[PDB]
C-alpha cells in the first residue's frame, strides 16, 4: 500500500476550504483522509494533512497543479516508495508512527532453541499489536532470563563509575530507585517510558525487530524510541550484534533521560525527515558514531556515551584503552566513515559535548536536499514544515518575545 | 504542603535526601527525584507531603545539605508560596472544588437529575482518561439549536477573525450543527491537534486560582451540562453553549492559546491580591474582550460569543471602551448580572500576551515559571536559571531560522 | 536640481563590475557620481551609490532597463519629486544630508522691529547655509541681551525639572551643566554640545537656518543627526515658544539625545521615514509630535514629561502634569492620525510606557509602511543599508546566532 | 609623562556626582581631565573617563581610597608603566590614539647612501609626527623614481592575485584600482584610501612615522584604526621586505581591511589586546604574525593567502602555496607559542578555516586572557566600553534584541 501525503497550506478565503475539500471529492477520495487544521504559524492559513496510499495515486497529479496554480499554494508530495519528483515520506503526527512500526538467523545463539524462538514470537506479537497511546504490556520474565540480565547488569555497573559519561552516571541511580534497575529485576518498558516521559518527554515504543534507519530515526524526531522487549539468549550473555533489552535499558535509556542528549538525538531525527536515501545513510553513520559508539570529552579526559558501548561490557573497556584510534567529531568526514557491526570498532569519534554535536547536526542538516525545513511542535505532537517567508516571520517574532524576557530579566 | 528544591550532587546528596525522608517515615513514592535540565550537576526534588515534623526536614535540607527549599502551601499559610500544580496530572488534586431555587430548572425533576449526572462525570474524571460521552435528549438538542441558530447568524459580522477562522472546522469536524451537541472528547482531541489545549470536565465553578492555574498547562476546565430549555437565552451560569460557542474556537488559535496560557502561568504561586487582579484581567479579555481589526472592533470574549443580546450591545454605541492597559484593567470593577458598562479593546492577542507577561513580572514570587510541553511540567526557575533556559531556547529557534532561510 | 538615485546590488561575476560602470560612463555619469563598494552582509556582492540629479532623467530609464533586463539587478529607483511609482528619495550616507539641508520653509514676530535681531538672524542662517557635514560648528559670541534671554528661560525651567521632567532628562542635565556650560549666564556653543552628544550616543549637531520638511528632518534622525537652530528668540518675549530657538533645542532635545534608549527611539522614527510615502511621513511627524515633541512617559509611580516642546516651555510643562490635560496610552495606529494644533497648549497627550517600548512600537509601525525594502543604519560606515534579499537575511540571522552563541557561553 | 587612568562608575544619588568631581578637583586634577558620561546600560549610573599621567600619582591612592570606600565604587586602575595591581593601559576613545601614536620603535638600510632618500623619510615622518585624529591625511606627490618602484611591485603581484589571493582580497581589489587609484603608474594617497576604508568597514588610516609596539598597534585595531606608513621602500631593491612601506600597507592590508569579515576578525585581535599582560601581548603578536601577516585560509577544497606579508611579497606569495611550506591548522593555543623568524620565508603557515571561524577562535582565546573586565567597541561613540559580567550580558542581549527586530521587519519584505 505504501503511504502518500500532500503537504500544503491554504489561505482562508470565502469558499477556500469549501473547494479544496471538494477537490478531493471530485476525484472521489474519501474525506476522512483529508484533515484540515488551522496553520500553527500563519493566523490566516489552513494546513491540510492527507492520509493517503498508492490507491489514491491515479488522481494526485491533477490535484497538485490546480492547488499549485488554480489556488497558488506550495504543495510537497510525500511518497513511501521514493519515486520521481517526490519527497521521501515521513509521518507528520506522532500517531502516524503506527503506520510502519511493524515494517521489519541461522547463526543466532538461539537457532536450535525452540523455547527461545517461541518466546521471541511472543514479544514480536506484543509489539505488532502496540499502538501509540496504549500502555506497554508487562511480561514476567523467566528466571533464566533474569540471570542473563543479572550477568549483563552486574559487570557493567562496575565499569560505569570510571568508563561511563557523567550524564549516564548522574541518572542511573534514579533508575535504580524508581525503575527497578537492579541486578535481580528486569525493568518493564512501561515504567521506563513513564520515567523518560517525565524527564525529557521521550517515550518508548515496543518494536518486534529492526526498522529501516529512516523509520527508526524518524521516530527520534518525535522523541519516540522504538525499543525491543526481548532479551538475548542466555547461553551467550555477552552476545551483542542484535539489540536485546539489555542494549535498550542500559545503553539508551539513561541518556534519553538528559535534555541535551535528548535534544541532540531528536536533532538527528529531525534531519532524517524527507532526507533522500543517500542522506539517511549518512545520518545512520553519524548515528553509529554518536548515539551508538560515541565518546565525549569530560574536562581533561574522555568518557563513553554510546549505547553500543554502555551495553557491551567488552567494548566499554576497549574504547577507553589507548589501542583504539580517536578523531574529534567531524560530520563532513564522520558521515562517510566506514564501520563494521560485528567487530570491535577500530575508530571512535570524540565529541566536545552533546550541545556542540547538536549544533553540528543542525548545521549538517542544511546540506540535506529538502524543499523545506522542519520544527517539532511538542504541543500538538506534530511536525511543522517550514517553507514560507511569512512562517519565518512568525518564528522571528516568537524569538523576539523571548529576547524581551531575557532582557527584562537582566534588569 | 509541597516542597520544591534543587541540590548539587556533592558528597552523596541524593542518598542523604532519601535517608532524610526515611528517618521521617515518608515513603519514597512521595519523593519525586529528577535530574536538572540546566545544571548537569544537580537534581530536582518534588514531594507531595504528614504535617507534624515537616520543620525537621526543611531545616535539614537547607542547612545540612545546602539546598534552596520552596514551601508551597494551599492553606494560605503565611511565609509559604500559594500552592499550584506542577504536573498536568496534579490538576486532579483540586478539580473537585465547586460552589439554586432561582434556577429556571429548579422545578424540573429530570433537569435536576441531569445536573447531578454531569457533576458526577466531572467529579469522577481524572487526567488522561477519555471524557465520558453522553446522549443528549431531543429537548437538550433543540435548546442548543435555538442558541446555535441565533448566534451563528451574528458571527460573520460581530465575531473576531480567529473565531471565524476556526468555526468552519468545528462544524466540519466536531459536529457543530444546530441539531447536534458535540461530545467534549471530540472537541478535546481537535484542540489537541490545533494548539495542544485539552478539556477537563468540571462540575461547576472552581476558584480563580484553580481555574487560571489550569490554563498554564493549556488545560481548559469545561462544563458539560446545558442550560434549562425553558430559558434558552439564559447565559448567567457558564453552560455548554458558553464553552463550545464562546471559548473553544479561540482556544484553537495559536496566539489566543498563548495569551490565555500566559494569564495562567502568571497565576502560579501568585498572592491572593494578584489572583484577584489576574481574574479581573481575565474577565476583561478571555470572557468580555473586544479586539481591533483594522478600523473596526470585533468581539472575542466567550461571554460575548455565547450571549446573543450582549454580542450586539457590545459592538454598539452604548458601552464605554478603553484601550487595554493592564495596570488600569487589573483594577477594574465588574458585575456578573448585567450587560457590562465597560469593555477593554486589545490590538491583538499577540500584544495582549506581551502585556500580561510584563504585568506578571510585577507579581511577587520567589521564582519564575516556564511550561514544558514535552514533560507536561511547569518548571520553577531561580533568576539565574531563567537566563540560561531562555538563552538556550533562543539559541535553538535561531538555528531553525538560519536553516530555514535557505 | 532635485535628486535621483538608483539603489541596487549585484553579485560579482566576471566583468559584472565593469559592465555596470560602462553603462553609467556611456551616459555621461562620471565615476564620482557612481561609487561601488562591497556589500556589508553578502561577501560576494557590490552595493552601488548614485549621486544623480534631474539632469540625468532623460537617460535614467534606459540605464534602469539595462540593469534589470541585461545585467539582471534588482533596482529601486529613488526620486525626490516622487515621480511615476518611484520611492521617495532619502540620503544613503551621512554626508549626503548636505544635499538638501538648506530647503527651508517675520510679520508679527517679536523681533521684527529690531534691526540688530534681524541681522543676527541672517548671521545665524548664513552659518547654516555654509555648514557642511564634518566641519566644526562655527562658534559665535553671544551678546549680554541674548545670554539674559537664555537665562530667564533656563532659570524658570531648571526649578521645575526636578518635579516635572523624566528621569533620563534629569540624569544628564547636570552633566551638561558641568561639561558644556549649561549655566544661566552662558549660551553654550553648538560645537561643544555636538561633541558631548557624539561621546554619549553618537548623536551629532547640524545647524539649520530654519524649519526643514518632516521627510528631510526625520531622515536626519536615522543617522543620529539632529538639525539644530543656533539663533535665540528675541529678548522682548522670553516665553515665546512658536519657533524652535536655541533654547528649545538645547533645553528640550539635547538632554534626551544623550540617552541611549531615547537616541535609538528617535532614530527609529527616522529609519522608518526613509522612503516612506507622503502619507506615512505625515503619520511619522504626528507620532513625532506626540512623542519627541510633547510626549509623556510612565515612571513607576508617576507620569513625567519628556517632549522637547514641554521641557522648553515653562507654562506647558506645568499644565501637562496637572489634571487639565486628557492623557491616553501611546497607541500608534490611533496616535498617527491624532489631530493637533501648534497654536495653544495641547488638549491631549499620549503616555509612553517607556522609550524602549515606544521604540518597538515604532519598529512595528514601520513594517506597515509601504516600501520595497527595510533599512538598517551602519554606524561604522555611517551609511544606510537596504535589506531586500533572502541572501541578506541569511547573514543577518547567522550573526544573530553568533551573539546568541556568545551570550550562552557568557552565562553558563 | 606616561598615562594613568581610573575606570569607575557611580550611581546617581543626590550630591553623588559633585562629591566625585570634587575629590578630583580638590587634588588639582582639573575638570578637563575627568569626563563623566551617562552609563549606557545602567540608566541611573555615570561613567567616568579620566585622562591622567604620572603627575597625578602622588594623589592617586587617596582618590582611589575614597572612591572605593567613601563612595563604594569598583575602580580599575590603568597605568602605562604597568606596575603590579594595575591594568596595562590602553586608549578608551579613538582620540586617545593620538597620545602614544608617536612612540616609534639604519647603516645597512638599502637607502643609507642616498641622501635624497634619507631626507624624504624625514618628510613622511614629519607628516605623521604632526598628524592628529580627525585631520585629513596630507597628500604627497610622489616622484617618478618612487612610482617606478610601486609599479614593479604592483605589476608582479596583480598578475598573481587571481590564483593566489583569497576571495576577499580579489573582491575588493578591482574597486581599489577603480576608485582609489591603485594602478601600475600611480601610488595612491592615504587620504583617498582611508575614506574608501571608512565607506567599507569603518577602518581608517592613521599616518605613522615608523613601527609601534605591538600593544599600541594592536590596540588601534580595536577601533578599526590601522596605523599606516606613507613612505615607500628605496628604489634600488624593490623586492626589499623588512620594513613595511606603502607597498605592504596598500597592497597587503588595504584590500582585506575593506572586507567586513576580515575587519571584524582583525578588530577582534585588537579588542583582545586592550589591557592584556605583556605575556599575552606577545601571544597575540604571534597569532597576528600567522593570521593577518602571514596567514593562509581554506577556500573550498583549495587554500589561498590572506597575510599582508604574503600579498605584498611576490616571492613568498608564490612560495606559500607550493609544496615547500609546512602547513598546520590554526589553533590559537598552539599558534600563540609558535617560533618564527622575520628575515626568511616562513617555513610554517597556519591555515584558517575562514575569517569568520578565525574571529571566534580569537574571541575564545581572549576569554582566557587575565583582565578584570570585558571590552566591546561602540562605533557610535568611537569608544571602548569596559564591562563587568552583568553589563556584558546586557549589551549582548540588547544587541540581539535590536538585530532580531530588524530581521522581523525585513522578513515581511
Query: From the candidates B90, B243, B287, B379, which is the catalytic residue?
Result: B287
- Partners of A393 on chain D (C-beta within 8 Å) are 408, 411-412
Q: C279 labelled as ligand-binding?
A: no
- Partners of D412 on chain A (C-beta within 8 Å) are 389-390, 393
Report how far apart the first and last C-alpha atoms of chain A are (Å, whole number).
59
Decide if A258 and B35 are in contact by the 8 Å CB cutoff: yes
Cell of D93: 576613545
Yes or no: say if D375 and D384 are a contact pair by the CB < 8 Å rule.
Answer: yes
B50, B8, B10: which is closest to B29 by C-alpha?
B50
C87: Cα within 13 Å, side-chain hemisphere: 21
Query: From the candidates B6, B60, B208, B306, which is the catalytic residue?
Result: B306
Decide if D412 and A389 are in contact by the 8 Å CB cutoff: yes
Shortest CB distance from D396 goes to which of C17, C399, C406?
C406
Give the three-class secondary structure for A348: strand
Q: Which residues precede chain breaks (C–N over 2.5 Å) in chain D?
A: 105
Query: From the candidates C146, C248, C249, C316, which is the catalytic residue?
Result: C248
Cell of D155: 605589476
H or E stretch covering D241 = none
D322, C379, B116, B35: which is closest to A200 by C-alpha?
B35
Alpha-carbon distance of A363 to A382, in angstroms, equals 22
Yes or no: say if A207 and A103 are a contact pair by the CB < 8 Å rule.
Answer: no
**SS (HEC) of chain C:** CCCEEEEEEEECCCCHHHHHHHHHHHCCCCCCCEEEEECCCCCCEEEEEECECHHHHHHHHHHHHHHHHHHCCCEEEEECCCCCCCEECCCCECHHHHHHCCCCCCCCCCCCCCHHHHHHHHHHHHHHHHCCCCCCCCCCCCCHHHHHHHHHHHHHHHHHHHHHECHHHHHHHHHHHHHCCCECCECCCHHHHHHHHHHHHCCEEEECCCCCCHHHHHHHHHCCEEEECCCCCCCCCCCCCCCCCHHHHHHHHHHHHCCHHHHHHHHHHHHHHCCCCHHHHHHHHHHHHHHHHCCEEEECCEEEECCHHHHCCHHHHHHHCCCCCEEEECCHHHHCCCCCCCCCCCCEEEEECCHHHHHHHHHHHHHCCCCCCEEEEECCCCEEEEECCHHHHHHHHHHHHHHHHHHHHHHC
Q: Does A346 touch chain D (CB under 8 A)?
A: no
Phi and psi at residue A238, to the nearest 5° = -105, -5
CB under 8 Å to D80, separation ≥6 — which residues? D2, D3, D4, D88, D89, D100
D79, D170, D96: which is closest to D134 by C-alpha?
D96
Alpha-carbon distance of C289 to C308, in angstroms, equals 10
Alpha-carbon distance of C305 to C161, in angstroms, equals 9
Alpha-carbon distance of D225 to D95, in angstroms, equals 11
CB under 8 Å to B49, separation ≥6 — which residues? B1, B2, B3, B26, B30
Residues of A with active-site annotation: 247, 252, 292, 311
Alpha-carbon distance of C97 to C204, in angstroms, equals 12
**Residue A35 neighbours by CB distance under 10 Å:** 17
Query: From the candidates B242, B260, B262, B310, which is the catalytic residue?
Result: B242
Separate counts of helices (H) and strands (E) for chain B: 17, 13
Bridge-based pairing state of the strands B42-47 and B69-73:
unpaired
- Partners of C406 on chain D (C-beta within 8 Å) are 363, 396
Alpha-carbon distance of A84 to A98, in angstroms, equals 26
Q: How many residues does chain A have?
A: 411
CB under 8 Å to B185, separation ≥6 — which residues? B130, B131, B132, B133, B199
* Residue A257 DSSP class: G
Decide if D412 and A392 are in contact by the 8 Å CB cutoff: no
Separate counts of helices (H) and strands (E) for chain D: 16, 13
Alpha-carbon distance of C361 to C352, in angstroms, equals 10
H or E stretch covering B165 = helix B161-173
Output the CA angle C61-C63-C64, nearest 5 degrees.
65
Question: How many structural domains are present in chain C?
Answer: 1
DSSP string, B87-126: BGGGHHHHTT----TTSTTTT-HHHHHHHHHHHHHHHH--
Chain A, 216 to 275: residues with Cβ < 8 Å from chain B are 223, 257-259, 263
Q: Does B394 touch chain D (CB under 8 A)?
A: yes
Active site residue C312: yes
**Residue A389 neighbours by CB distance under 10 Å:** 13
Decide if A409 and B368 are in contact by the 8 Å CB cutoff: yes
Alpha-carbon distance of B180 to B174, in angstroms, equals 10
Active site residue B247: yes
Cell of D216: 599600541
Active site residue D248: yes
Cell of B19: 535517608
- Partners of B394 on chain D (C-beta within 8 Å) are 400
Cell of B31: 519523593
Yes or no: say if A324 and A294 are a contact pair by the CB < 8 Å rule.
Answer: no
The domain spanning residue C237 has which CATH number? Answer: 1.10.800.10
Give the three-class secondary structure for A48: strand
Resolution of the coordinates in A? Answer: 2.5
Alpha-carbon distance of B70 to B369, in angstroms, equals 13
How far is A397 from chain D, CA to nearest CA, in Å? 6
Residue of A nearest to B398 (CA): A399
**SS (HEC) of D195-208:** HHHHHHCCCEEEEC
Yes or no: say if C346 and C326 are a contact pair by the CB < 8 Å rule.
Answer: no
Q: Does D404 touch chain A (CB under 8 A)?
A: yes
Helix extents (H) in D108-166? 115-129, 144-164
A310, A304, A314, A290: which is closest to A181 by C-alpha?
A310
Distances (CA, A) of C121 to A140, C114, C126, C235, D209: 101, 11, 9, 13, 47
Instruction: Name the maximum alpha-carbon separation found in chain B.
Output: 70
Decide if D389 and C366 are in contact by the 8 Å CB cutoff: no
Q: How many residues does chain B have?
A: 406
Yes or no: say if A375 and A386 are a contact pair by the CB < 8 Å rule.
Answer: yes
Bridge-based pairing state of the strands D383-387 and D374-378:
antiparallel
Yes or no: say if C197 and C205 are a contact pair by the CB < 8 Å rule.
Answer: yes
Report how far apart the first and last C-alpha atoms of chain D are (Å, whole number).
57
Q: Which residues pair with C225 in a beta bridge?
A: C204
Cell of B95: 478539580
Chain D, 156 to 195: residues with Cβ < 8 Å from chain C are 167-168, 171-172, 174-175, 178-179
CB pairs < 8 Å spanning B and D: 3
Q: Subunits touching D (CB < 8 Å, at least 3 pairs)?
A: A, B, C
**SS (HEC) of A319-331:** HHCCCCEEEECCH
Helix pair C278-288, C214-222: axis angle to 10 deg? 70
Alpha-carbon distance of B293 to B299, in angstroms, equals 10
CB under 8 Å to B348, separation ≥6 — which residues? B255, B291, B292
Q: Does D393 touch chain B (CB under 8 A)?
A: yes
Yes or no: say if D311 and D169 are a contact pair by the CB < 8 Å rule.
Answer: yes
Cell of C215: 521627510
Yes or no: say if B96 and B124 are a contact pair by the CB < 8 Å rule.
Answer: no
Shortest CB distance from C387 goes to which of D37, D392, D410?
D410
- Exposure pattern of B3-23 as b/e (b: 16+ CB <10 Å)? bbbbbebeeebbebbbebbee
Yes or no: say if C35 and C8 are a contact pair by the CB < 8 Å rule.
Answer: no
Specify whether the backbone of D392 is left (phi greater than 0), alpha (psi in -120 to 50) or beta: alpha
Bridge-based pairing state of the strands D204-207 and C4-11:
unpaired
Q: Does C368 touch chain D (CB under 8 A)?
A: no
Alpha-carbon distance of D244 to A217, in angstroms, equals 58
Cell of A165: 559519561
CB under 8 Å to C149, separation ≥6 — which residues? C232, C233, C234, C235, C238, C247
Q: Subunits touching A (CB < 8 Å, at least 3 pairs)?
A: B, D
Give the three-class secondary structure for A221: helix
Distances (CA, A) of D250 to D97, D169, D186, D192, D311: 21, 12, 12, 11, 10
Alpha-carbon distance of D147 to A18, in angstroms, equals 78
Shortest CB distance from B398 goes to which of C390, C394, C400?
C400
Q: How many residues does chain C have?
A: 412
Return binding residues of A for Fe cation.
Answer: 247, 252, 292
- Partners of D400 on chain B (C-beta within 8 Å) are 394
Q: Does D135 touch chain C (CB under 8 A)?
A: no
Q: Which residues pair with A78 in a beta bridge?
A: A5, A87
- Exposure pattern of D73-95 as b/e (b: 16+ CB <10 Å)? bebbbbbbeeeeebbbbbbbbbb
Decide if C36 and D178 are in contact by the 8 Å CB cutoff: yes
Contacts of residues D388-392 at CB distance under 8 Å and 24 or more positions apart, as own/partner, are D388/D74, D389/C410, D390/A410, D391/D41, D391/D42, D392/C410
CB under 8 Å to B90, separation ≥6 — which residues? none
Cell of C370: 509601504
Give the three-class secondary structure for B352: helix
Helix extents (H) in D181-229? 190-200, 214-221
Q: Does C409 touch chain B (CB under 8 A)?
A: no
Q: Which residue has the cell 542547612?
A: B63
Yes or no: say if B325 and C329 are a contact pair by the CB < 8 Å rule.
Answer: yes
Alpha-carbon distance of C232 to C254, in angstroms, equals 16
Domain of C2, in residue numbers: 1-412
Q: How many residues does chain D have?
A: 413
Helix extents (H) in A288-350? 307-310, 313-320, 331-334
Cell of D159: 598578475
What is the sign of the dihedral through the CA atoms of C31, C35, C37 and C42?
negative
Alpha-carbon distance of A306 to A292, in angstroms, equals 4
- Technique employed here was X-ray
CB under 8 Å to C344, separation ≥6 — which residues? none
D74, C271, B397: which is closest to C263 by C-alpha?
C271
Yes or no: say if D231 and D215 are a contact pair by the CB < 8 Å rule.
Answer: no
Q: Does A14 touch chain B (CB under 8 A)?
A: no
- Partners of D402 on chain C (C-beta within 8 Å) are 264
Decide if B387 and D393 are in contact by the 8 Å CB cutoff: yes
Cell of D200: 567599507
Q: Does A38 touch chain D (CB under 8 A)?
A: no
D46, D4, D42, D47: which is closest to D384 by C-alpha?
D47
Cell of B109: 425533576
What is the sign of the dihedral through the CA atoms of A198, A199, A201 and A205?
negative
Q: C293 labelled as ligand-binding?
A: yes
B387: Cα within 13 Å, side-chain hemisphere: 18
Cell of A13: 478565503
Specify whether the backbone of C28 is left (phi greater than 0), alpha (psi in -120 to 50) or beta: left
* Residue D16 DSSP class: H
Alpha-carbon distance of A410 to B38, in angstroms, equals 18
Alpha-carbon distance of D362 to D354, in angstroms, equals 12
Q: Does D354 touch chain C (CB under 8 A)?
A: no
Yes or no: say if A231 and A120 are a contact pair by the CB < 8 Å rule.
Answer: no
A216, A175, A218: which is closest to A198 by C-alpha?
A175
Shortest CB distance from A403 goes to which of B34, B173, B394?
B394
Alpha-carbon distance of B140 to B135, in angstroms, equals 10
Amino acid at each position: 500500500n505504501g503511504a502518500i501525503s500532500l503537504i500544503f497550506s491554504l489561505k482562508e478565503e470565502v469558499g477556500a476550504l469549501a473547494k479544496v475539500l471538494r477537490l478531493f471529492e471530485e476525484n472521489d477520495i474519501n474525506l476522512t483522509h483529508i484533515e484540515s487544521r488551522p496553520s500553527r504559524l500563519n493566523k490566516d492559513e489552513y494546513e491540510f494533512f492527507t492520509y493517503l496510499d498508492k490507491r489514491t495515486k491515479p488522481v494526485l497529479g491533477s490535484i497538485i497543479k490546480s492547488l499549485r496554480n488554480d489556488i497558488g499554494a506550495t504543495v510537497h508530495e510525500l511518497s513511501r516508495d521514493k519515486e520521481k519528483n517526490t519527497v521521501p515520506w515521513f509521518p507528520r503526527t506522532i500517531q502516524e508512527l503506527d503506520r510502519f512500526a511493524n515494517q521489519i538467523d541461522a547463526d543466532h545463539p538461539g537457532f536450535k532453541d525452540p523455547v527461545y524462538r517461541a518466546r521471541r514470537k511472543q514479544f514480536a506479537d506484543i509489539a505488532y499489536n502496540y499502538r501509540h497511546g496504549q500502555p506497554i504490556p508487562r511480561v514476567e520474565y523467566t528466571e533464566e532470563e533474569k540471570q542473563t540480565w543479572g550477568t549483563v547488569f552486574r559487570t557493567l555497573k562496575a565499569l560505569y563509575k570510571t568508563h561511563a559519561c557523567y550524564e549516564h552516571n548522574h541518572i542511573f541511580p534514579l533508575l535504580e530507585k524508581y525503575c527497578g534497575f537492579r541486578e535481580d529485576n528486569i525493568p518493564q518498558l512501561e515504567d521506563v517510558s513513564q520515567f523518560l516521559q517525565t524527564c525529557t518527554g521521550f517515550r518508548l515504543r515496543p518494536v518486534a525487530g529492526l526498522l529501516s534507519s529512516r523509520d527508526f530515526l524518524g521516530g527520534l524526531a518525535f522523541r519516540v524510541f522504538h525499543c525491543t522487549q526481548y532479551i538475548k539468549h542466555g547461553s551467550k550473555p555477552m552476545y551483542t550484534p542484535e539489540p536485546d533489552i539489555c542494549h535498550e535499558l542500559l545503553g539508551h535509556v539513561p541518556l534519553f533521560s538528559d535534555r541535551s542528549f535528548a535534544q541532540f538525538s531528536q536533532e538527528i531525527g529531525l534531519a532524517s525527515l524527507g532526507a533522500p536515501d543517500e542522506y539517511i545513510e549518512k545520518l545512520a553513520t553519524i548515528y553509529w558514531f554518536t548515539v551508538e559508539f560515541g565518546l565525549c570529552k569530560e574536562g581533561d579526559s574522555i568518557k563513553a556515551y554510546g549505547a553500543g558501548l554502555l551495553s557491551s561490557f567488552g567494548e566499554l573497556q576497549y574504547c577507553l584503552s589507548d589501542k583504539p584510534k580517536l578523531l574529534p567529531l567531524e560530520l563532513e568526514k564522520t558521515a562517510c566513515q566506514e564501520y563494521s557491526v560485528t567487530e570491535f570498532q577500530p575508530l571512535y569519534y570524540v565529541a566536545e559535548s552533546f550541545s556542540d554535536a547538536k549544533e553540528k547536526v543542525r548545521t549538517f542538516a542544511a546540506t540535506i536536499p529538502r524543499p523545506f525545513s522542519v520544527r517539532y511542535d511538542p504541543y500538538t505532537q506534530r511536525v511543522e514544515v517550514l517553507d514560507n517567508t511569512q512562517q519565518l516571520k512568525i518564528l522571528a517574532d516568537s524569538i523576539n518575545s523571548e529576547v524581551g524576557i531575557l532582557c527584562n530579566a537582566l534588569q
